[PDB]
Amino acid sequence: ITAKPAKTPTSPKEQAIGLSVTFLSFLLPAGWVLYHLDNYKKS
Amino acid sequence: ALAKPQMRGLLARRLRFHIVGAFMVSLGFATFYKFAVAEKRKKAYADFYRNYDSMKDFEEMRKAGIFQSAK
Amino acid sequence: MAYPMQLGFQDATSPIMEELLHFHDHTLMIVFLISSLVLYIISLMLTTKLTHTSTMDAQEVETIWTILPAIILILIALPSLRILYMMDEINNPSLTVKTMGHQWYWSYEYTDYEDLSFDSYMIPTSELKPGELRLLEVDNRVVLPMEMTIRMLVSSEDVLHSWAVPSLGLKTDAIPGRLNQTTLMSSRPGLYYGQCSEICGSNHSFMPIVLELVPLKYFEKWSASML
Amino acid sequence: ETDEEFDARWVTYFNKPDIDAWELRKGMNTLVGYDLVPEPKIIDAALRACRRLNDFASAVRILEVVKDKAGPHKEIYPYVIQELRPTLNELGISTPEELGLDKV
Amino acid sequence: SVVKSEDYALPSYVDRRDYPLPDVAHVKNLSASQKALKEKEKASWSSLSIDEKVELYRLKFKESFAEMNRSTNEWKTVVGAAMFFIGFTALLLIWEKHYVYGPIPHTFEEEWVAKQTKRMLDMKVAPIQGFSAKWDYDKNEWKK
Amino acid sequence: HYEEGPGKNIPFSVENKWRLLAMMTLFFGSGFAAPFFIVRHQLLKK
Amino acid sequence: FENRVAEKQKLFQEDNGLPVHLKGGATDNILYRVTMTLCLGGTLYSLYCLGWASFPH
Amino acid sequence: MFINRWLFSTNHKDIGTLYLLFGAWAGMVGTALSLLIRAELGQPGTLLGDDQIYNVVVTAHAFVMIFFMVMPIMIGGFGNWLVPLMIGAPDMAFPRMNNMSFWLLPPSFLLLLASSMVEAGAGTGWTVYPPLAGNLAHAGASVDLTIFSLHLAGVSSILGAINFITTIINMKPPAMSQYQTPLFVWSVMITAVLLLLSLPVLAAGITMLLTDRNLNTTFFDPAGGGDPILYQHLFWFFGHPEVYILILPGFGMISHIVTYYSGKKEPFGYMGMVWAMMSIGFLGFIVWAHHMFTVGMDVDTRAYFTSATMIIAIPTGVKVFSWLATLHGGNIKWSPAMMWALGFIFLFTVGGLTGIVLANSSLDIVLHDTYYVVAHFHYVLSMGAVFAIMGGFVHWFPLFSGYTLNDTWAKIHFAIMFVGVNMTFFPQHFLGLSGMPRRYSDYPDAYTMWNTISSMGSFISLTAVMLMVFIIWEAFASKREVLTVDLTTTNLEWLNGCPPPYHTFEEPTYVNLK
Amino acid sequence: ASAAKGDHGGTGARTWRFLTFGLALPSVALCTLNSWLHSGHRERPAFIPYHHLRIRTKPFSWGDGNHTFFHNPRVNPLPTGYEK
Amino acid sequence: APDFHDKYGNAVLASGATFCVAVWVYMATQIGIEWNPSPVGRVTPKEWR
Amino acid sequence: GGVPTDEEQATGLEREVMLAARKGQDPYNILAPKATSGTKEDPNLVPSITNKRIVGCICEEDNSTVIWFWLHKGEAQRCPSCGTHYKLVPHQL
Amino acid sequence: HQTHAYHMVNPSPWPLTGALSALLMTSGLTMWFHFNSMTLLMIGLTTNMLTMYQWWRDVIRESTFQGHHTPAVQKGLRYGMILFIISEVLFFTGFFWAFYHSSLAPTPELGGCWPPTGIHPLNPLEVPLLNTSVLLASGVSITWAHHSLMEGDRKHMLQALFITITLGVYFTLLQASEYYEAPFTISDGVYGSTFFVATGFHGLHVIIGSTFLIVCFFRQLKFHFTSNHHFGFEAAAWYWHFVDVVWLFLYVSIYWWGS
Amino acid sequence: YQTAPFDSRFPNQNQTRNCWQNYLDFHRCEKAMTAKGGDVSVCEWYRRVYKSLCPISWVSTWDDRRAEGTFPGKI
Numbered sequence A: 001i002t003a004k005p006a007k008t009p010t011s012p013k014e015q016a017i018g019l020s021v022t023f024l025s026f027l028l029p030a031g032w033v034l035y036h037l038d039n040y041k042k043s
Numbered sequence B: 001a002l003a004k005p006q007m008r009g010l011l012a013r014r015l016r017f018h019i020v021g022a023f024m025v026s027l028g029f030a031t032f033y034k035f036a037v038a039e040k041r042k043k044a045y046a047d048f049y050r051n052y053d054s055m056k057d058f059e060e061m062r063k064a065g066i067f068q069s070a071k
Numbered sequence C: 001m002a003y004p005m006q007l008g009f010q011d012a013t014s015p016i017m018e019e020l021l022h023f024h025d026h027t028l029m030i031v032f033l034i035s036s037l038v039l040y041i042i043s044l045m046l047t048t049k050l051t052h053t054s055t056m057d058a059q060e061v062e063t064i065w066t067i068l069p070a071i072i073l074i075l076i077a078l079p080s081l082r083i084l085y086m087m088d089e090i091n092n093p094s095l096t097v098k099t100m101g102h103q104w105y106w107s108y109e110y111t112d113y114e115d116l117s118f119d120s121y122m123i124p125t126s127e128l129k130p131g132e133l134r135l136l137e138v139d140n141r142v143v144l145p146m147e148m149t150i151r152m153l154v155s156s157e158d159v160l161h162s163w164a165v166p167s168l169g170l171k172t173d174a175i176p177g178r179l180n181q182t183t184l185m186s187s188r189p190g191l192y193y194g195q196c197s198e199i200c201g202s203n204h205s206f207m208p209i210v211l212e213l214v215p216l217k218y219f220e221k222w223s224a225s226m227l
Numbered sequence D: 001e002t003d004e005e006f007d008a009r010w011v012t013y014f015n016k017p018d019i020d021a022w023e024l025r026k027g028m029n030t031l032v033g034y035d036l037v038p039e040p041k042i043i044d045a046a047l048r049a050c051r052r053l054n055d056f057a058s059a060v061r062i063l064e065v066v067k068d069k070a071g072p073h074k075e076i077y078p079y080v081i082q083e084l085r086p087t088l089n090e091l092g093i094s095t096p097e098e099l100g101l102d103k104v
Numbered sequence E: 001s002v003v004k005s006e007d008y009a010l011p012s013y014v015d016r017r018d019y020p021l022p023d024v025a026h027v028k029n030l031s032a033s034q035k036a037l038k039e040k041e042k043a044s045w046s047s048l049s050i051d052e053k054v055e056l057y058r059l060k061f062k063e064s065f066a067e068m069n070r071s072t073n074e075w076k077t078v079v080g081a082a083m084f085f086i087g088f089t090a091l092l093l094i095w096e097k098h099y100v101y102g103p104i105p106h107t108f109e110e111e112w113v114a115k116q117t118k119r120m121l122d123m124k125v126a127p128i129q130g131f132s133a134k135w136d137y138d139k140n141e142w143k144k
Numbered sequence F: 001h002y003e004e005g006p007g008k009n010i011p012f013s014v015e016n017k018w019r020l021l022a023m024m025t026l027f028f029g030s031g032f033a034a035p036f037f038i039v040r041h042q043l044l045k046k
Numbered sequence G: 001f002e003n004r005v006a007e008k009q010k011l012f013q014e015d016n017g018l019p020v021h022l023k024g025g026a027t028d029n030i031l032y033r034v035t036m037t038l039c040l041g042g043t044l045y046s047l048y049c050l051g052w053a054s055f056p057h
Numbered sequence H: 001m002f003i004n005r006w007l008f009s010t011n012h013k014d015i016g017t018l019y020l021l022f023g024a025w026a027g028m029v030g031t032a033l034s035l036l037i038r039a040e041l042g043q044p045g046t047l048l049g050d051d052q053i054y055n056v057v058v059t060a061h062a063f064v065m066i067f068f069m070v071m072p073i074m075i076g077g078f079g080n081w082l083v084p085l086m087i088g089a090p091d092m093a094f095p096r097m098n099n100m101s102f103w104l105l106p107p108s109f110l111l112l113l114a115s116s117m118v119e120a121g122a123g124t125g126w127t128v129y130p131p132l133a134g135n136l137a138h139a140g141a142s143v144d145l146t147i148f149s150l151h152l153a154g155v156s157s158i159l160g161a162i163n164f165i166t167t168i169i170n171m172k173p174p175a176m177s178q179y180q181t182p183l184f185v186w187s188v189m190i191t192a193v194l195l196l197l198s199l200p201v202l203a204a205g206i207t208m209l210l211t212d213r214n215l216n217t218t219f220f221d222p223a224g225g226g227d228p229i230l231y232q233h234l235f236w237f238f239g240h241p242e243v244y245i246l247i248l249p250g251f252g253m254i255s256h257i258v259t260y261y262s263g264k265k266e267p268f269g270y271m272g273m274v275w276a277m278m279s280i281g282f283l284g285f286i287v288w289a290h291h292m293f294t295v296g297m298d299v300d301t302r303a304y305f306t307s308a309t310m311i312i313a314i315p316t317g318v319k320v321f322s323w324l325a326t327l328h329g330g331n332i333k334w335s336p337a338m339m340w341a342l343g344f345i346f347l348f349t350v351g352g353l354t355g356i357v358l359a360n361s362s363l364d365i366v367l368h369d370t371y372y373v374v375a376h377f378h379y380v381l382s383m384g385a386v387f388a389i390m391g392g393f394v395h396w397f398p399l400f401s402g403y404t405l406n407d408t409w410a411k412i413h414f415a416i417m418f419v420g421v422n423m424t425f426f427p428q429h430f431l432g433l434s435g436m437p438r439r440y441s442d443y444p445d446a447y448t449m450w451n452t453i454s455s456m457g458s459f460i461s462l463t464a465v466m467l468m469v470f471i472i473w474e475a476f477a478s479k480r481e482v483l484t485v486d487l488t489t490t491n492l493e494w495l496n497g498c499p500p501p502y503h504t505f506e507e508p509t510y511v512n513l514k
Numbered sequence I: 001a002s003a004a005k006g007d008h009g010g011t012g013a014r015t016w017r018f019l020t021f022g023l024a025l026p027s028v029a030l031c032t033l034n035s036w037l038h039s040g041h042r043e044r045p046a047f048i049p050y051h052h053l054r055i056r057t058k059p060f061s062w063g064d065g066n067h068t069f070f071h072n073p074r075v076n077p078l079p080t081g082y083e084k
Numbered sequence J: 001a002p003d004f005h006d007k008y009g010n011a012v013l014a015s016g017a018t019f020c021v022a023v024w025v026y027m028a029t030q031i032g033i034e035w036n037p038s039p040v041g042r043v044t045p046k047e048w049r
Numbered sequence K: 001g002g003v004p005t006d007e008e009q010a011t012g013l014e015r016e017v018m019l020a021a022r023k024g025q026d027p028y029n030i031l032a033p034k035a036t037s038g039t040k041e042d043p044n045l046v047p048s049i050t051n052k053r054i055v056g057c058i059c060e061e062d063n064s065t066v067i068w069f070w071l072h073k074g075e076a077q078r079c080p081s082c083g084t085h086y087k088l089v090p091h092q093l
Numbered sequence L: 001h002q003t004h005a006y007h008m009v010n011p012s013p014w015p016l017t018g019a020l021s022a023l024l025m026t027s028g029l030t031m032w033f034h035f036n037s038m039t040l041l042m043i044g045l046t047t048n049m050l051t052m053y054q055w056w057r058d059v060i061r062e063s064t065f066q067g068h069h070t071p072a073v074q075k076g077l078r079y080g081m082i083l084f085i086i087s088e089v090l091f092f093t094g095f096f097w098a099f100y101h102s103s104l105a106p107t108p109e110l111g112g113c114w115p116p117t118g119i120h121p122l123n124p125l126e127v128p129l130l131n132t133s134v135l136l137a138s139g140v141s142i143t144w145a146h147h148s149l150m151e152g153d154r155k156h157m158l159q160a161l162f163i164t165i166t167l168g169v170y171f172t173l174l175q176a177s178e179y180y181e182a183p184f185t186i187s188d189g190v191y192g193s194t195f196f197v198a199t200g201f202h203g204l205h206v207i208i209g210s211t212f213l214i215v216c217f218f219r220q221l222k223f224h225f226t227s228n229h230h231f232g233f234e235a236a237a238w239y240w241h242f243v244d245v246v247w248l249f250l251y252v253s254i255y256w257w258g259s
Numbered sequence M: 001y002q003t004a005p006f007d008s009r010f011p012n013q014n015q016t017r018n019c020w021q022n023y024l025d026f027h028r029c030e031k032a033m034t035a036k037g038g039d040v041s042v043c044e045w046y047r048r049v050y051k052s053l054c055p056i057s058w059v060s061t062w063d064d065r066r067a068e069g070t071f072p073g074k075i
């Protein structure tokens, strides 16, 4: 397949932000619940 | 001058050569597997039970104190 | 029981479990050969710059790759079905034991002569004696005579469970309203472990089975003293 | 059909005096579908057809695809070029190597 | 040269080893001199220069076979980055072991395991091949 | 009639990549987080 | 009865851009609104009920 | 405008897109449920609570992955986008009913999430066997909300299947016979005939469970003369065909991908591929009690189910080899889509081969209700149905969106996932042979080493999932718009451009009858 | 078979109406006669509290929870027996 | 002209690999994970009764 | 009597198709077109209401592969697999 | 502007309303079964009936009033209905399977015999035979209706259809009375469970088929059907034969052989 | 008498009817001996067989129901 160059290029730094915010959107809520599991278990 | 090389059926010739290789390897593997795993197994059981003495095995376990029903 | 880093079956403890080991060896050899043939043909197809992209004729090659597999299946089915029918053969038991699944324990009933029955519960981890196996020990073991043909009958009085002892090759579901039979013969004395093998609620993981296989005369005296 | 009848069909295909540019492309693109490198005499008829169609570039491309169809058999392309040399000479067809077009 | 989205229904150019003569010329608009070159191509190709022969090739096609078939260093990036995220995954499992998991059961303490191992040998666990088979009951040690 | 073409045959906007990042984060993250929170619900119950 | 299909054909073919579910006139709009109101209100109510049933009582 | 377009749709492409979005969101829920599983099992002891909570997680994991992830992607998503394009049809036969198929899934998903929020959840297994799923051992609303969830998912797929079968038989060009349709379209049709026949039987059996729970019937209760095992037969009479349903559209996409990145105009042995799909379809309805080999069935019944089950290897082997023969002589394009398909071919074959080990009722006595089963079915699902989904996704993403993915990132994603799933599931064969049962929150100490590794592999898969999401972001963020796609002559769905207009084939193709 | 009648030249409306009035509806009047005759109350059998009958694992969601949806006091006993 | 891979390829590879090997070696040996390996050839059996 | 006929009451596209079929016509493409000999002198004639239509060519009877390509207004085009000729004939309905 | 013969349907809200109404009815039956309330259920039944009425109203608009049902569109409807009925046959099949499983191997709890101890079945030669003759008769009167319609005969079409509907209604009243009279109930073990569930789903299908025949009766009153184009009527006729065949299998299985 | 022997009438894994039938037989036999003023001890074999085979909760439940008048088998 051929394609045009990006209309709105996403630089290395922008990819690092996208990637980081993506990993954190999955990690933080689940990490928060898991870390507080003992607090739940005795409640 | 260069001699004329084969120019036709190159893909088919390569295929033939390697399928026969694969068949040969496969017989050779069957051979090794029946030696290293299957006969090894049959022989371990055969050798174990050949002169196995169940009462003696029991008495050793009983002396070791493992049983509820036999002190 | 299973030991750390185990790869295959627990060592066989009955003739029928031995037979299942050899038949598994035979089938896995086929499994390994077919999948390594596939992986190999795959790498063969992908490692050449030579091309042949025009229509290829398919009626010829399809014979091989239809008949060979049929043959291999028959080579599997034949020893498979021999073992099947062996497990079904009439055998004349000397003893019948019933086990009833419950949430979450087994009870055993040995009622050919006297009314002997008792309940068999996992030893909690904090009460294990030194050397004992987490999740696997019970307070009252299923004591049985070694080298004898025993008929086990398996049922439940609440939800499904399933009665398993991997060493002997046994797994018989425990369904309420029904009486399932299996036959149990140990070639050797000792302790043989299993775990409930149908999901049955909060403590499915914690209602194990321990057979204790000993000489007839020791079994008889234990039976008497269990009354 | 025999090897010889196959080759003769292709030769005659490219030898058609008023072969058009579509038939040229269709013949070449069909032919490289097969499990073979084309005989010199088929490539010769396709190269003469490029000449009657006034298309020097497709002649160079035909040479490239001979070399490509041979895959790892590195002896095949120098042989075919050896055999085409009088034709290459007569039509003024430069090889891809003589044009630098074998460099990456 | 310039390919447009709204051209999808028109024959298009492709560089593929198995489609050597694509449906259109890579370059269709010609300059004054490119036009003079196509006229010249109608006469003997022996009179074309090497440079002219190249320029005709480059009007008709975009990349040569050796260009389009070239290998790249992409694998180093794919393999390196895959190891990187796999490496990243270990950080998650470190966090999990530190903050999520508590102590494991006392049955894995070294003295429990030693006694449990003796007891497995006393009950002859897997005496044919799996476990006890590897203990020497005469020399009182693991088979060497 | 409807807009057509890249970016327009979808129920979400891709006009701004950062707003898009927010929207995709909420959408996938809410999927991922729900079982954690249901587990929590259940622990905090009885 | 008399065959009045032709009239309905003329009504439902009127070039007014209306979707078929609203082309019959003003009653179609009422029945639509009643339907969609019961469905969305009933749906918010089933959520409320879930919230309620989600905790011990 | 918005609501007309996306809530009132009658367009196959926009409904196909909604299914893709729904199925991706379900994939994240399913992935979370699966990490909770492996976290519980990732060290010896009890992480979350006892078996009740653990198996509510286990049950929802299965239901979400099968019903809300795999089927909606493959059939609602790829099926609705692609099948009308590939037969030059202007839409589906019933475009309005097609949209109710879609809109039944969010409420079916809500009832599943409700079931887990009320009471103590349905900790029953995705097979919902009684009496554990009955009103004494699972008193209260959770199992009923589960049943109702399945009713709606059922109705959704039975109306889908009627739509697909009708559209495929009735809406081809007048010159095109059924043997001139692409293999993906054949796989959707066969798949839909299976949904049509099998889901009404599951609906009957889960209805009897509902009445047993709520109307004092006793279909499955021995006190009124019923039989728990009748429920298993009903369920399985659906459940075996269901797994052929989860795979067949995956086989279709595979054949399109392999063909396309081998530079081939057509798959090897077309008619054999058809015959194989129809045979697997048919055979998939007569083998169901291979899920019952420990329940206490007579021996001849077990002999026959062992043999009928094995025979499926033959047509399935025809497909595997025709895929290899399609690669043979290809001009091989190493795209991320091709890598997922090559992995599919090998890792499906491994999980199909341990299916065959399990078909042997004698050995299944010892493998049944152990992790050997679990390793089998994740090879074919996590590395079979899922690999096809991923290869289909990266392949047709530019068609659906008009934008390209970054191939390098997509290659990295494949590599991470490949390692993560193999590290997860491979050691579970050892766990299974050595006797670890299914549906356990904890295990005897000897099983620790493999459970630890398996849990670690599951985390590696997590990272692959989160990466996929960033990759899809990146594509939409950067906006590299597609220009030329090769092989359109034998890939009609690409010929209206990327993305195709809302309405395509307003003037049908012209195909001569000759 | 063929039953014992005739026509088959054409299956038209006249034939099907002939069958509706000359066979089908007389069969209905026959069966309706046979039934409105064997009707009359059959003598309710002694109550025996069999444990496989009158099942109650959960109260019915109507009434007092203990009565079936079409409960007929004459002929359906409750688990404790016939009603006053 | 050199693409991303010509310029960064060797470094991504060297440093992805170093980092992967390091952190997994750390995780595996330094944080209290109990692998439960076979006692065979490593545990000295001890009297339990 | 009393039951309308299609002649009396059929409407919209149903009517258009039924009236065109009486005239032996197929404006809504219900039938498959019969092939001509497909030469440059006798190309298959492809009606269209725009200036391009996608053609599917079944090169040989019972091929399972159909070959698909846009036909554009202008000189005849050839199937890229078998070279059979097609020519568009635009406008109307 | 299309030049194929297929129907592109105007964007419609009835799919979403039908979906939500499924959510309200299943949520509703939950609340009824477990939380002693019928409110959700009643709201779901309501929006369901509204959705069906408007969706099928619109199909009528599209066909009789707008002319979208070309032969090809019609052929597709035929496949759709035949497929739907197939799936309804499989659904009954699971209930027949349950019946034979229980009855071929009666468990000790029933007395080890079928019909169970304490079960006194209806006499199949009584009202169940009447029901049979009624449904068979209504298959004959509906075929009369179909031929009249093809023959362009308005009045005999409506008379035969009315007769077919009154017979469906008679079956339904007879069956409701039989339910009242029956000395066994749904709670009477697997015998009551299989009896009432299988015949009660059949009764539901009779009501639904009767309602479909009534829709056709009023369309015919309003002259919608031509002598050649009347798919609504065909579909309902096929549904009706389906409902009759089902009953003949119930009669033979549960009432006769299972007595 | 060790245990119940193999009975060719119940050759399969499900042994539920083996138990039931021997339970019935024993109790029919007692009834008939006790009608015709005979010796119940001829019935003892079926008692041993059903005792060996049958779960205690099933005999106990069936005993209660025969005492209650609600046993569904025919004796």
Ligand SMILES: CCCCCCCCCCCCCCCCCC(=O)OCC(COC(=O)CCCCCCCCCCCCCCCCC)OC(=O)CCCCCCCCCCCCCCCCC
Pocket: C007, C008, C009, C028, C031, C032, C035, C036, C039, H350, H354, H422, H423, H426, H427, H429, H430, H433, H453
């Ligand atoms: C991930 C953790 C692994 C831990 C390893 C074991 C430790 C040894 C201790 C130290 C060794 C101690 C010696 C004692 C031997 C006792 C053996 C036994 O009792 O009896 C039976 C055992 C024997 O098992 C084994 O002998 C290991 C088999 C390894 C197969 C090849 C895969 C290895 C590839 C790469 C790494 C694995 C992940 C890739 C997975 C790929 C999926 C196939 O149990 C099994 O059944 C497991 C296999 C299940 C069936 C699936 C088979 C199809 C596989 C595909 C073939 C790929 C083609 C080439 C292979 C392709 C490679 C180029």
Ligand code: HEA
Pocket: H020, H021, H023, H024, H026, H027, H028, H031, H034, H035, H037, H038, H058, H059, H061, H062, H065, H066, H069, H070, H073, H124, H125, H126, H127, H374, H378, H381, H382, H385, H386, H389, H390, H393, H421, H424, H437, H438, H439, H440, H441, H458, H461, H462, H465
């Ligand atoms: C499709 C089916 C499917 C899939 C893909 C998976 C994936 C996984 N499952 Fe599985 N699992 C089942 C179906 C599936 N599973 C079933 C049916 C059972 C048994 C239920 C029961 O016993 O009752 C089960 C049981 C089961 C168990 C056994 C529980 C027990 O017996 O106690 C385990 C434990 O490790 C497990 C783990 C996992 C893990 C780690 C994955 C991982 O491989 C997952 C990693 C993530 C993905 C593969 C994401 C996939 C796709 C998307 C995110 C969509 C992307 C969207 C677009 C591109 C549009 N599962």
Ligand code: HEA
Pocket: C034, C038, C068, C069, C070, C072, C073, H127, H243, H244, H246, H247, H290, H291, H309, H310, H312, H313, H314, H316, H317, H318, H320, H348, H349, H350, H351, H352, H353, H354, H355, H356, H358, H359, H360, H364, H367, H368, H369, H373, H376, H377, H380, H381, H384, H385
């Ligand atoms: C996409 C999902 C999928 C697919 C396609 C399959 C395919 C197969 N399954 Fe699988 N199965 C599951 C999903 C799947 N299964 C699930 C979810 C469960 C558990 C359900 C539960 O309890 O929750 C399960 C459980 C299950 C069981 C029950 C085990 C038990 O519970 O004890 C069995 C038993 O026979 C089985 C067998 C097979 C077989 C023979 C195939 C065959 O179709 C595979 C055929 C393929 C091949 C053989 C490889 C290709 C062929 C060749 C290369 C040719 C040559 C090969 C030979 C000659 C052998 N499966």
Ligand SMILES: CCCCC/C=C\C/C=C/C/C=C/C/C=C\CCCC(=O)O[C@H](COC(=O)CCCCCCCCCCCCCCCCC)COP(=O)(O)OCCN
Pocket: H151, H154, H155, H203, H207, H211, H215, I068, I069, I070, I071, I072, I076, L029, L172, L175, L176, L179, L180, L181, L182, L183, L184, L185, L186, L187, L196, L197, L199, L200, L201, L203, L204
């Ligand atoms: C002439 C026959 C007409 C049938 C309609 C009658 C009225 C009730 C409405 C329900 C219709 C649905 C049919 C099947 C449902 C189950 C039972 C119905 C058959 C019936 O009506 O049986 C009655 C029991 O009704 C009961 O329990 C009442 C149960 C009423 C609650 C209905 C249950 C709701 C759950 C059904 C969910 C259906 C899920 C189906 C999904 C289909 C696939 C998507 C029998 O009466 P009895 O007093 O027990 O015996 C007579 C004693 N003289």
Ligand SMILES: CCCCCCCCCCO[C@@H]1OC(CO)[C@@H](O[C@H]2O[C@H](CO)[C@@H](O)[C@H](O)[C@@H]2O)[C@@H](O)[C@H]1O
Pocket: A027, A028, A029, A030, A031, A032, A034, A035, E092, E095, E096, E099, H035, H036, H039
């Ligand atoms: C199954 C998939 C799960 C993947 C594993 C997730 C790995 C990364 C988890 C990061 O998430 C967090 O990290 C914390 C610590 O690292 C937490 O902070 C807690 O910990 C602190 C440090 O003790 C305090 O600063 C805070 O108040 C706080 O509540 C917590 O909130 C959480 O969001």
Ligand code: CUA
Pocket: C101, C102, C104, C160, C161, C162, C196, C197, C198, C199, C200, C201, C203, C204, C205, C207
């Ligand atoms: Cu008992 Cu699981």
Ligand SMILES: [O-][O-]
Pocket: H239, H240, H243
């Ligand atoms: O189901 O395999």
Ligand SMILES: [Cu+2]
Pocket: H239, H240, H243, H287, H288, H290, H291
């Ligand atoms: Cu199956």
Ligand SMILES: [Mg+2]
Pocket: C162, C197, C198, H294, H368, H369
């Ligand atoms: Mg089981």
Ligand code: NA
Pocket: H040, H041, H042, H043, H044, H045, H046, H047, H441, H442, H443
């Ligand atoms: Na755990």
Ligand SMILES: [Zn+2]
Pocket: K057, K058, K059, K060, K067, K079, K080, K081, K082, K083, K084
């Ligand atoms: Zn052609």
